[PDB]
Design a protein around this ligand. Sequence first.
Ligand SMILES: [Mg+2]
Ligand SMILES: [Mg+2]
Ligand SMILES: [Mg+2]
Ligand SMILES: [Mg+2]
Lengths: 196, 199
Amino acid sequence: ITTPIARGLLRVGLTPDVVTILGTTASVAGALTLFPMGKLFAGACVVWFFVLFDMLDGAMARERGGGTRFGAVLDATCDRISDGAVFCGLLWWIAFHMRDRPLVIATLICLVTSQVISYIKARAEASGLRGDGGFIERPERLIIVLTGAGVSDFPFVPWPPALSVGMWLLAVASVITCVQRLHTVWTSPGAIDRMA
Amino acid sequence: ARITTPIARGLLRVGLTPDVVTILGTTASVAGALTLFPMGKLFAGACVVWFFVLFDMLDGAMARERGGGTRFGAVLDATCDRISDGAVFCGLLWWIAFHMRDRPLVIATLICLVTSQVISYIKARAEASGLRGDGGFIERPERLIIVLTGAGVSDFPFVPWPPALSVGMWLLAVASVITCVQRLHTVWTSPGAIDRMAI
Ligand SMILES: [Mg+2]
Ligand SMILES: [Mg+2]
Ligand SMILES: [Mg+2]
Ligand SMILES: [Mg+2]
């Protein structure tokens, strides 16, 4: 399915980089429009939709002979922007409509740790070390927070506490992941040799 | 230097390592930001954060006195910068959201919080692929100068000017968004950036 769509996009002169940006813009607009209004199930559906959309830029890149280093950096940077918009959008609902200050704390931990978890991996690789793995990578992050948000606002059978359950589980697991990833850095070949 | 070096040798002699000092200074800076800023003690908070900016010269001085920095230590020091920056903006966010109840300034603060992480990420992620992703208007020194001067002046002893917090945050938000674009352009122009490769 993605292959004929990708080819059709290449055919009209779109590039993987433009499609990356367009999908990210749409996801961000969706998260920042729907979550602050309390439309958490709709917001989660829109975010998941653009997760699916995100299969197209990689498919486009493979078809035309390969991805680029800029494309990889752009794609990963857009992932951070997207994650940020999800948590900021939810934060707005939680802070100003639910007025739930403990949940704001969990949400802010999730927001910062999402960025920090990804940063450890990139910064480690920039030094020739490893810094991947751990409990929470981007797929687990999105499954947890979007399922919490979606269930909390689910049609006909909503369970509002689901939003808090997801955010607190994610916050704890994300802090642990930071420590795990730093431990992976520390054990990498060459990580602790002094360089004058 | 004539001051950090003797201090750094002292901490090594006591048995502290650069990495432990990195973690301790960052914990203290986070504790200060998350205690003082949410209480509205913005001048005292800015002073504490500034003190630990000075303190972060010590772990690098220690590493050099030991015979060299380490790659782990470089990753750790950079990662703790993201954590510290995160704590500054979260602490200020708390005061702005729940005590000033100033919703447009919350938007600026969230933009600063996210862009502080994204700006740094572009550089690290570019280097991970062998490209360059530094430069632009807002790096960590400019970021701290703007937000901590805005916070401190808004709560300055004797002659406070409360709008300084908003001025600083909006200027930082705008300049930070621009910096994200600048840095990605720097990635794009790096040698080899657009050669195709198997994924
Ligand atoms: Mg994709
Ligand atoms: Mg991606
Ligand atoms: Mg340092
Ligand atoms: Mg540091």
